[PDB]
Amino acid sequence: SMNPPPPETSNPNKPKRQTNQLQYLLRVVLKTLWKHQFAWPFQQPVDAVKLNLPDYYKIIKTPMDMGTIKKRLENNYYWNAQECIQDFNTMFTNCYIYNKPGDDIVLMAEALEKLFLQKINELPTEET
Ligand SMILES: COc1ccc(/C=C(/C(=O)N2CC(=O)Nc3ccccc32)c2ccccc2)cc1
Numbered sequence: 001s002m003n004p005p006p007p008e009t010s011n012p013n014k015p016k017r018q019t020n021q022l023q024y025l026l027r028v029v030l031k032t033l034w035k036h037q038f039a040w041p042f043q044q045p046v047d048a049v050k051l052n053l054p055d056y057y058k059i060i061k062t063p064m065d066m067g068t069i070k071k072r073l074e075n076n077y078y079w080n081a082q083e084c085i086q087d088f089n090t091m092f093t094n095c096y097i098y099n100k101p102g103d104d105i106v107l108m109a110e111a112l113e114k115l116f117l118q119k120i121n122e123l124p125t126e127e128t
Pocket of ligand 1: 040041042046051053094095098099104105
């Protein structure tokens with residue numbers, strides 16, 4: 001089982017903005033999760049070949065990872081914060097769908113998600 005192409009990170013056809021909420025997603029949310037001891041499984045797309053998970057992309061049809069999110073933020077891919085927040089939540093959801101409760105990787109995702117929810121609770125007001 002081969003890996004699929006990665007999610008899109010560049011698309012000049014898609015309109016973009018640079019906004020204080022999106023800046024916060026990078027500078028606070030992404031950086032907080034990225035530096036966490038439990039980040040490494042989530043810092044790039046799932047490599048189904050290396051990890052010997054031939055069924056991963058048969059089960060997970062909307063893959064997402066922080067490597068992709070970091071590219072999206074750094075390369076200003078998004079129109080709004082909710083798109084980026086959706087990405088995070090897709091990545092968590094995929095983990096929980098694919099694995100079993102109390103698997104280490106589920107514990108790792110839950111720790112990152114706790115931090116994520118606390119940062120998103122303080123998402124700044126949109127500048128006007
Ligand atoms: C410390 O225990 C761990 C750590 C990571 C993983 C999961 C990894 C991972 O993303 N996946 C996808 C996944 O969702 N589950 C899974 C199950 C078995 C093996 C790998 C994985 C991973 C990531 C990078 C390198 C190697 C593995 C699973 C358990």
